[PDB]
Amino acid sequence: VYSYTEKKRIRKDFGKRPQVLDVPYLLSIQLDSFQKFIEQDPEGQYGLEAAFRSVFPIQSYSGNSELQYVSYRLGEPVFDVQECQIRGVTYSAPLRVKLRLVIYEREAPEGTVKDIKEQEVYMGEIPLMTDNGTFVINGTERVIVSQLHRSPGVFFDSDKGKTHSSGKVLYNARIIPYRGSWLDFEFDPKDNLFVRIDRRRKLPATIILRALNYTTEQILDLFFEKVIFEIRDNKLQMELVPERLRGETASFDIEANGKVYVEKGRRITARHIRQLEKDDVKLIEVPVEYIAGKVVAKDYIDESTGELICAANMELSLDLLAKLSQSGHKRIETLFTNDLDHGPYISETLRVDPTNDRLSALVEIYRMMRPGEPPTREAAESLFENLFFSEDRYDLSAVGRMKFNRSLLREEIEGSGILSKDDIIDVMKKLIDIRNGKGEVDDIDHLGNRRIRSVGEMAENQFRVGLVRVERAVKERLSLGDLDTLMPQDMINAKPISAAVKEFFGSSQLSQFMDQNNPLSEITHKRRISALGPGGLTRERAGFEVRDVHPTHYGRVCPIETPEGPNIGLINSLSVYAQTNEYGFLETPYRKVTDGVVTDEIHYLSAIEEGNYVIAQANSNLDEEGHFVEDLVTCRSKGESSLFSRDQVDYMDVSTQQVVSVGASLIPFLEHDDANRALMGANMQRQAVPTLRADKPLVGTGMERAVAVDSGVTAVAKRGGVVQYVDASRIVIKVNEDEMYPGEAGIDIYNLTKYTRSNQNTCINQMPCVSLGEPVERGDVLADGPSTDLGELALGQNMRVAFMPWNGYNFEDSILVSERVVQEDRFTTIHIQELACVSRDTKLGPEEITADIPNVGEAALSKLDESGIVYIGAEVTGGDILVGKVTPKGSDVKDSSLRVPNGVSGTVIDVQVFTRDGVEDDLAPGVLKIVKVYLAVKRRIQPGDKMAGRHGNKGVISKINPIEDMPYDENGTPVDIVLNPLGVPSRMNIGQILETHLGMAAKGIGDKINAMLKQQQEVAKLREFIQRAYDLGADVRQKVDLSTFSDEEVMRLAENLRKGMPIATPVFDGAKEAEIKELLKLGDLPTSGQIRLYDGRTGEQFERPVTVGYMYMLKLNHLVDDKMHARSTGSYSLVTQQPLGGKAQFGGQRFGEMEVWALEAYGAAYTLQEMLTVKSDDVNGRTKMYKNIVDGNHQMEPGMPESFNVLLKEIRSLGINIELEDE
Amino acid sequence: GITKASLATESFISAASFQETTRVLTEAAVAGKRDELRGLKENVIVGRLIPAGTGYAYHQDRMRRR
Amino acid sequence: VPLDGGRFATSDLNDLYRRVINRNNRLKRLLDLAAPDIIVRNEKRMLQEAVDALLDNGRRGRAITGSNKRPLKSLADMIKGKQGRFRQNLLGKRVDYSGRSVITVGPYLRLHQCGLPKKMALELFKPFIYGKLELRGLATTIKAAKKMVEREEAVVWDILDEVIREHPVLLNRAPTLHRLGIQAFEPVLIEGKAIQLHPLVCAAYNADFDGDQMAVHVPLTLEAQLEARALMMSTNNILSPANGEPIIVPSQDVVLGLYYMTRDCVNAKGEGMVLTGPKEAERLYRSGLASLHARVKVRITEYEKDANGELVAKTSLKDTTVGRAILWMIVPKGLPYSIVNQALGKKAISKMLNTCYRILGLKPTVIFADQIMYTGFAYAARSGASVGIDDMVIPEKKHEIISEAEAEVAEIQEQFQSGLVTAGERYNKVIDIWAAANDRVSKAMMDNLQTETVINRDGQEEKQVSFNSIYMMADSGARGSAAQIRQLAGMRGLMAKPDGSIIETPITANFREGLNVLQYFISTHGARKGLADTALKTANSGYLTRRLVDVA
Amino acid sequence: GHIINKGEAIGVIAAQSIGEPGTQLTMRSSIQVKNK
Amino acid sequence: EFDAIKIALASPDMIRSWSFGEVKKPETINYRTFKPERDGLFCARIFGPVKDYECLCGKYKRLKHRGVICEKCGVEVTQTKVRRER
RNA sequence: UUGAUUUGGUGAGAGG
DNA sequence: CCCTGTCTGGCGTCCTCTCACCTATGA
DNA sequence: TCATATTATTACGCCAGACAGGG
Ligand SMILES: [Mg+2]
Ligand SMILES: [Zn+2]
């Protein structure tokens, strides 16, 4: 069964693997994030309720009044989205917050408040999201791009090689909170443990232990195990568990029980450990040279004399043993400092520590954190107890506590947001364990260690900034509060919240202007994962590994769609099936595989879960039950693609599109292209302009439907039914009764957005693709947007392309185009320019909007009214007048009248005017005369534009040939576009050839149907040929149910197929070559894909037959009459005497540094002298040169450049006396 | 090395158009240094003929007529 | 200056000077009032820090800032840096009489001239047109001439063709690395908006035609026109200054046209007929009586200059082809016939132009470079040298080689289950057998491409080098190598993960067969590393050129 | 073909000729005789 | 025209010889009109007249007496680029 | 004597 | 007193194009 | 409108160059 615009033109779908999970809604990141931000969600998480339950109830410092919270709300926007874009306002909503002030008496923690008051106060306006995932910030339509940042929670990083210049590794450990102070632990090459807070000075780390009220003995209890020396009959014997001797040299005689176990000289093996455990050896008598290097654990005091024997962490000598033996402390606890495993790092750090108690530890930490200003008991204790341990200024979130408990192998995952003693001690213990050998480091590119921020999280953080500023203001007003003469808007202020949230949505590194020239480009700018932004890395610094693809990107981030240039791999784009985890990580679908039978249930995993399991490959042959047809299958275990058994796997990939994104899964024959050319192909495919006549890719992938629907450029029907079709203004849909509400009788009236400006000056336009009185279903499309054709996605157009060299006109990457491409207007795109004119009151009275234009004669009053402003629609070009806008006293009158820029033509499509109340409306103040004029240039195609296919084959269209000179085959049809075969062996993008052959076969079927329907046959022969065309070959998913198309839906389908039968070649499970040959045999075309072609010039055959087919070629928006520029003489800058830069400023070319070196490389001394003195800078030289040229005397009078005298005055404006010496 | 050798030149404009200008201008200022131009980039700065190419005859003439 | 609006966008130095003057006025008033010691110490200290912030901001502790947190730019920051006065306004300047547009090919050009659009030509040459218009007497004042070219009447295009004629222009591609990236041409006017640039010259500019842009500069004075014609003309730059190798080497289409032209096949039309000259060789090719590659005795007259500057004619019968005689009609007099008697790939045509330059000098080498380019484009058009899906011939021996390698890794892993061998020796044995199987697959496809054609002549079969399209694009040296044609037919090797170590399971599928998912992902590892390396390598390459031209 | 002329700047063409191929360059038992 | 460029330290007598007037007030401009400040950073007497050969305030609107400085203007009378060198 | 403001500076994206 | 970690400064590619956004205070 | 004058984040990678520490 199919829907009714699905039976219009059903695309022949190759593809063998049955898909189990349909594609999710492609804008779900933006929409789910912002629906989390604004939603009335009780239990508090997450949203605006989390912000209000953190900041409220505010109580002042015993001021006996406590403003509390009830509920919030967002009213209607005063401006709907269209008139909001037209006017220039934000698309926002007012945030109505109920606030309940209760005020206490004296001595009421428990007492009832003396008075209440409550009102629905107004704080800020928050910008709502449009239904397509965009904002409208100040007239312009912007997009917040989801960030990719390091997760909160501990990270054990190594930095193995570069420091110390000696090959000795370090090991640092960063506890990254979501909000607050950063705590890092780090070794130094003396093997001492150092703490630093917020990248400040370096403190030896155990001082933080001494700041947590730990004595030295408790610290040595934590990080060391005790070895017991018992004072006995002679020589102070030792308790010896045999584990401690692992891998060391026997220094003494190892004997017990009257038996010599191990003699001196040999190392202790594990067999000797087994001998000591079998022989039950604990107590052995040691020599006095064994204790002469060990370190005491706890303190001991001489009992009778009443003084100290030795402090804790003191090494022992023989006379120290003579001190402690004669006193009466029989047990001696020593620190086992194994050189192999259990290193003495804490103990040597305690030897570095200049402190002894808790108070001096806090004084040293306070002198680290805030220097100069004195360290007193209260101040240092409040500092250190609010560094990590208060809920205000330090908060690992739920993500942070999950990562923090997971990296320490804790059992639980939910806990308190602050740290504790035990958490810092566990981070130090795991760091020491990593130094000892057990456990390993973490990598930072691993996407289980890399969280995503999105729109709701970022706006919530900015809103929390605004709320803590307004609670500091409420605490300000309340202690100065007199009662009862205030109601809660003398306390609260709507200004800081609105200021902060408009600061983020207006001027941030991620709230950025939407790439809007294409439905693909909208839908792939909204699905973007940037590594940049606040708190993340920068473009010009890092690095090599964060720019590189890591094995956790499989199914989370597209491997091949990343922009080339200065930021590669920082601006990653999200995969097709990848959702976002509850904690913000990237979870991708897999199919749960209990045993041999691969089950059709799906189950989502992130990269810290994908490593443990064994996950299969998407295309592994399984037949009729889910059993893998082989006994061994390629899977990947822990980021390592390896071959495993038939019955070991726990998950399988869902579908074979899932590695790549929605930009680079629209490329058919992706698997035959190179990776580089797929990258260039996807990045150029974002850049296509919408043509005037949208044209249905013959070789698509079937993902065109989901992109063209899910990006909101088409008018998808909300409720199904029939149609009334007034449509000149709006589609009117009568609703079927089952989908129709009992009250609100109701018929749906869709607004078509006609010719208007996009963000990239292209033309967004919707056209109805349903007739009058025609059934439509829910979810069906009604109006085709820009670059769409019956709900599919038509960026460029499909044209007949020959691969051959043609007389040099397609030399490096150029492209030679017939005249049939430019006669049919099949790339003639439509651009729209907005031009503003204002008549602000700068000085000497206000400016004026009158046709009575001066000096200039009846060449002003022309495309305007009888007395002012461009009339409505003519063919205006360059140098015309649109809005007469000139003042008197500015003879002394002048011409600021906004005219048409140089080089452009067009038709005035619209004139908007919300001018200074007097022009003879709704807008803001200040600005007076506000006249916006919308031109619409129609640019065709010309030598110099840029076209490209989908595979990375760029081209600048070189010669626009006549129809006659084209290479025609023996049937008579010219070929449209000639490309060059030499690009194909080097640039290994062989997929464009299979697209060429399969598009040739598609139009072969289209020509066959066009013959069977033009030379008109009764519909039995058409339905037989359509059935043969839709069966065609191997086991596929489509077949068709064609005998249920009522003898008319066969004919309407065959009316929509006579331009070529559309073929879906999916991404990695595409059409094989034998099916291309078999489809080329169904059409009457030659099997090789190659036709003999004659030459239009000479009429004689090209030897060695050439390839002709249909490639889907796109017109990119790098048009040549936006790049052509020239300057002889005009205006310059102010500070310098050199020319201005750019095209919108009529400026000249920067003759840079390497061009000066290139002229020095020749003998061009005079060319360089005029290149930097006369042509550029020296004012007397250039006026004398212009007069010398127009007299007919090519001679320069050089002089000295002006910018060098600017250099002299800037150097001389220091204390520097730079001069110019003798004649 | 090449950056230490181009910053240690007897012509401070040649060593100031290149890397750090603060160090070189204070060294030249407190030394009272003087720049007998005599190279390519001093004459690209000060706006005259290069003493290499076509301008080598001009600089022969000017060096002869002193 | 104020921007568009009603407020003044003030510079940073005005903030610095205004603070120094505010503080200095405060300090004069406090020394008037006789404030105590600590007040005037803080006042003089704030003046010291204000002066020190004015001169070189940020050399003291954290730099002052106006809007919003960004520090404001001081005098020393008007001097130093990439954007000071030296590197931004004195070494490199913006320049009048200059233009910029997208380039395109135009292969009809001679290599001393380039195409230049009429709109750019009328804008860059406004003063010369004004001077020409004032000389004829058509107008009077300068205003009249500016109205005439603002209207663009019918008489200023003849004025424009009379100011262009012998006036060179400097074309310049935007990353100029060596001196061959600024070359002077003569304009030929173009209906259009794109600079037509002669193709051979592209190999000097590193200019393809995938969206490139170039700038045009006009030599104004008379010494600069003579420097553009006598030093910087494109005919004068035919050897690269880094070495002795010619830089006007024919790049890609033209070597395919020559390699298809001067070749042979064991039977064609007109096999072994005898021809009285190269003129009737081209007449037999055009009329349709012989083929472009058909071996034939011709009578050619090569001029060897064995005396002291005297050209001696020797005429003989060379057993050659039809295409070699047709290409002999273009070779100048002094070169011997054996420069065209071979197959003429890219190294051979480069040494052809090099021997022409060493013997016959500059002017025959310029005109012969143009005739090479014209005949290469013309017979590459006549060749019809496409690329198909059938041209990438899969080896029949490829699947058995992969199964023998799979049996070998099976033997090594069965030893690994029983622990006979070590892990590093296992990894080394797997990388060694996949390197050996890769070399065997490459030799299988290379035999299957380099001699696949087997055609008979008058009897039993006889083999020859193939006319496969991808093999001529590889063997000619136009575009392609052994590795790229290897990856389109044989297996594409053992790609390496970004750890730097290689991956033990290779990519056994080429591009004509489909890569599955994991193999493409390993491929993307290997290619993302290359794009990151180029896009970060270019900064160090440019900074190295800067340090080198400032030590020189 | 001839010797360098009196004047032609050789330092700049040399520095450009060394630094210009900077893009093409990469960034990141006993003796057995062969001939006789 | 000139040989070598000499760089040296700037003596206070040398800085007073460069100068044309002490910049006292920090007041940049009027900002509500168009006039500057007399006598602030952007002065008249210390540097020069904004307009070419005009007293900014009011006298000399032709080409006869280029130089006169009345008490009502406290302004020099030269070119528009004269302030760039002063 | 016949007319006028971006360069300034930041951020984001793109081309070769 | 000659090695020595450690800290502080100083580099980090040219050319071009599009868009938006710009200090608070205040009797 | 017309003078008043500066604070609560961290996450580069060498590579010279100068400095207090100690055998
Ligand atoms: Mg290119
Ligand atoms: Zn006056």
From the CA of D10, how many Å to the nearest CA of chain A? 7
| Cα C209 to averaged position of ligand 1 atoms, centre (Å) | 6
Q: Which helix (H) or strand (E) holds C27?
A: helix C12-33
Residues 6+ apart with CB under 8 A from C205: C173, C180, C181, C183, C197, C214
CA distance C75 to A166: 43
DSSP letter at A391 equals T
Residues 6+ apart with CB under 8 A from A978: A801, A802, A803, A804, A806, A809, A810, A815, A816, A817, A966, A967
Sheet of strand A153-157: strand arrangement: A153-157, A172-176, A183-188, A192-197, A203-204
Asked if A805 contacts C377 with a C-beta cutoff of 8 angstroms, the reply is yes
Q: Which helix (H) or strand (E) holds A452?
A: strand A450-453
Stretch 35-74 of chain E: residues touching chain A, C-beta under 8 Å? none
Asked if A522 contacts A707 with a C-beta cutoff of 8 angstroms, the reply is no
CA distance C500 to C493: 15
Which ligand has the minimum distance to the alpha carbon of residue E53? 2
Rounded to 10°, the helix C126-136/A1179-1191 angle is 40
Token code pair at residue A758? 């996009």
Domains A713-787 and A828-919+921-939 share a fold: yes
Minimal CA–CA distance to A604: which of A593, A591, A588? Answer: A588
CA distance C378 to C256: 11
Q: Give the DSSP letter string of A32-101.
A: HHHHHHSS--TT--SSHHHHHHHH-SEE-SS-SEEEEEEEEEE---SS-HHHHHHHT---EEEEEEEEEE
Rounded to 10°, the helix A216-223/A421-436 angle is 50
CA distance C511 to C391: 13
Cα-based angle A630, A633, A635 (whole degrees, multiple of 5): 165
Q: What torsion, rounded to 10 degrees, do the Cα atoms A296, A297, A303, A308 define?
A: 70
Token code pair at residue A483? 């009662």
Minimal CA–CA distance to C48: which of C84, C20, C15? Answer: C20
Q: Which residues of A187-208 are buried (b: 16+ CB within 10 A; e: fewer)?
A: bbeeebbbbbbeeeeebbbbbb
CA distance C125 to C169: 11
* Superfamily name with CATH number, domain A656-712+788-827+940-1123: DNA-directed RNA polymerase, subunit 2, domain 6 (2.40.270.10)
The CA–CA distances, whole Å, from A737 to A720, B17, B26, C267 equal 9, 80, 88, 79
CA distance A904 to A104: 72
Strand partners, A260: A255
- E strands in A268-337: 283-284, 300-302, 307-310, 331-335
DSSP letter at E21 equals S
Considering only CB atoms, which chain A residues are within 8 Å of E5? 1218-1221
Minimal CA–CA distance to C19: which of C77, C72, C76? Answer: C72
What residues of chain D have any CB closer than 8 angstroms to a CB in chain C? 1, 11-23, 25-28
Rounded to 10°, the helix C126-136/C142-151 angle is 120
CATH no. of A828-919+921-939: 2.40.50.150
- Number of cross-chain residue pairs from A and E with Cβ atoms under 8 Å apart: 40
Minimal CA–CA distance to A927: which of A858, A836, A1053, A861? Answer: A836
CA distance A152 to A181: 12
Contact (CB<8Å) D19/C552: no
Q: Which CATH architecture has domain A575-655?
A: Roll (2.30)
From the CA of C19, how many Å to the nearest CA of chain B? 23
DSSP letter at C272 equals T
Give Cα A183 distance to the centre of its chain: 28
Cα-based angle A737, A739, A745 (whole degrees, multiple of 5): 60
Cα-based angle C289, C293, C297 (whole degrees, multiple of 5): 80
Q: Which residue has the tokens 């070359």?
A: C183
φ, ψ at A824 (rounded to 5°): -80, 0
Give Cα D2 distance to the centre of its chain: 20
Asked if C435 contacts C496 with a C-beta cutoff of 8 angstroms, the reply is no
Which ligand has the minimum distance to the alpha carbon of residue E45? 2
Minimal CA–CA distance to C338: which of C357, C361, C314? Answer: C314
Candidate from B25, B46, B54 with C-beta closest to A1204: B46
Strand partners, C170: C184, C217
Question: How many residues comprise chain A?
Answer: 1223
Strand partners, C196: C104, C115
Minimal CA–CA distance to A429: which of A610, A206, A693, A643? Answer: A206
Give Cα E74 distance to the centre of its chain: 10
Chain D and chain E touch, per 3+ beta carbon pairs within 8 A: no
Strand partners, A453: A147
Question: How many residues comprise chain D?
Answer: 36
CA distance A786 to A693: 9
Token code pair at residue A817? 């185009």
Breaks (C-N over 2.5 A) in chain A follow: 890, 920
Residue A492 exposed, middle or buried by CB count within 10 Å (0-12, 13-18, 19+): buried
CATH no. of A152-224+343-443: 3.90.1110.10
Question: How many residues comprise chain E?
Answer: 86
Count of C-beta atoms within a 10 Å radius of residue E12: 8
Considering only CB atoms, which chain B residues are within 8 Å of A1169? 47-50, 55
Residues 6+ apart with CB under 8 A from A842: C6
Rounded to 10°, the helix C517-551/A675-685 angle is 80
Q: Give the DSSP letter string of A953-972.
A: -EEEEEEE--STTS-BBTTS
CA distance A229 to A283: 9
CATH no. of A713-787: 2.40.50.100
φ, ψ at A826 (rounded to 5°): -95, 15
Strand partners, A1093: A969
- Report the first-to-last Cα separation within chain B, whole angstroms: 36
A891 CB inside 7 Å of strand F: yes
**Domain residue ranges of chain A, discontinuous segments joined by +:** 25-151+444-574, 152-224+343-443, 225-342, 575-655, 656-712+788-827+940-1123, 713-787, 828-919+921-939, 1138-1223
Q: Which helix (H) or strand (E) holds A1014?
A: helix A991-1014
Q: What torsion, rounded to 10 degrees, do the Cα atoms A319, A325, A329, A331 define?
A: 90
φ, ψ at A1091 (rounded to 5°): -115, 145
Minimal CA–CA distance to A527: which of A485, A481, A477, A577? Answer: A577
Count of C-beta atoms within a 10 Å radius of residue A1183: 13
Rg (CA), chain B: 13
Considering only CB atoms, which chain A residues are within 8 Å of E1? 1223
Which of D5, D12, D13, D17 to probe by mutation at the C interface, max C CB count within 10 Å? Answer: D17
Token code pair at residue C105? 């090919």
Strand partners, C450: none
The CA–CA distances, whole Å, from C102 to A385, A761, C394 equal 65, 20, 41
Q: Which helix (H) or strand (E) holds C282?
A: helix C278-287
Asked if C110 contacts A1163 with a C-beta cutoff of 8 angstroms, the reply is no
DSSP letter at A672 equals G
Q: Which residue has the tokens 């193939």?
A: C466
Considering only CB atoms, which chain A residues are within 8 Å of D8? 1163
Q: Which residue has the tokens 């130093």?
A: C80
Strand partners, A869: none
- E strands in A1047-1151: 1063-1064, 1090-1091, 1106-1115, 1125-1127, 1149-1151
Contact (CB<8Å) A1215/E33: no
- Residue C158, SS3 per DSSP: helix
Considering only CB atoms, which chain E residues are within 8 Å of B28? 7
C350 CB inside 7 Å of strand H: no
CA distance A796 to A125: 41
User: Could you tell me which chain E residue has the CA closest to the CA of C14?
Assistant: E28
Asked if C518 contacts A617 with a C-beta cutoff of 8 angstroms, the reply is yes
Count of C-beta atoms within a 10 Å radius of residue A112: 8
Token code pair at residue A510? 């991620």
Q: Does C487 touch chain A (CB under 8 A)?
A: yes
Resolution in A: 9.9
Chain A and chain B touch, per 3+ beta carbon pairs within 8 A: yes
Q: Give the per-residue SS3 of C185-241.
A: EEEEEECCCCEECCHHHHHHHCCCCCCCEEEEECCCCHHHHHHHHHCCECCCCCECC
Q: Which nucleotide is nearest to A200 (CA to C1')?
A: H10
CA distance A546 to A526: 22
Residue A849 exposed, middle or buried by CB count within 10 Å (0-12, 13-18, 19+): buried
CA distance A561 to D1: 50
Q: Which residue has the tokens 């694009």?
A: C473
Asked if A791 contacts A821 with a C-beta cutoff of 8 angstroms, the reply is no
Residue B61 exposed, middle or buried by CB count within 10 Å (0-12, 13-18, 19+): exposed
| Cα B35 to averaged position of ligand 2 atoms, centre (Å) | 44
Q: Give the per-residue SS3 of A673-724.
A: CCHHHHHHHHHHHCCECCCCCCECCCEECCCHHHHHHHCCCCCECCCCECCC
Q: Does C347 touch chain D (CB under 8 A)?
A: no
The CA–CA distances, whole Å, from B5 to B10, B31, D22 equal 11, 18, 21
Enumerate residues with CB within 5 Å of ligand 2 (an ion).
E 55, 59, 70, 73
Token code pair at residue A777? 């279903």
Asked if A717 contacts A778 with a C-beta cutoff of 8 angstroms, the reply is yes
Q: Which helix (H) or strand (E) holds A511?
A: strand A511-513
Token code pair at residue A243? 């584990």
Minimal CA–CA distance to A55: which of A117, A112, A97? Answer: A97
- Residue E16, SS3 per DSSP: helix
Residues 6+ apart with CB under 8 A from C448: C393, C395, C396, C489
Residues 6+ apart with CB under 8 A from A96: A72, A73, A74, A75, A120, A121, A122
φ, ψ at A189 (rounded to 5°): -65, -5
Give chains near B: 3+ CB pairs under 8 A.
Answer: A, C, D, E
The CA–CA distances, whole Å, from C531 to A518, A779, C524, C537, C540 equal 26, 42, 10, 10, 15
Q: Does A1218 touch chain E (CB under 8 A)?
A: yes
Contact (CB<8Å) A1169/B55: yes
Minimal CA–CA distance to C197: which of C141, C123, C251? Answer: C251
Considering only CB atoms, which chain E residues are within 8 Å of B25? 7
- Report the first-to-last Cα separation within chain D, whole angstroms: 38
Q: Give the DSSP letter string of C447-470.
A: HHHHS--EEESSSSEEE-----HH
Candidate from E6, E9, E14 with C-beta closest to A1221: E6
Q: Which helix (H) or strand (E) holds A450?
A: strand A450-453
- Residue A476, SS3 per DSSP: helix
CA distance A63 to A765: 61
* Residue ranges in A280-357 assigned as alpha helix (H): 318-325, 345-352
Strand partners, A912: A932
The CA–CA distances, whole Å, from A937 to A825, A832, A940, A1121, C272 equal 14, 6, 10, 11, 63
Strand partners, A193: A187
| Cα C473 to averaged position of ligand 1 atoms, centre (Å) | 20
The CA–CA distances, whole Å, from A298 to A214, A266, A283, A295, A738 equal 13, 33, 21, 10, 83
CA distance A1199 to A524: 55
CA distance A998 to A1109: 8
Method: cryo-EM
Residue E14 exposed, middle or buried by CB count within 10 Å (0-12, 13-18, 19+): middle
Token code pair at residue A397? 């979130």
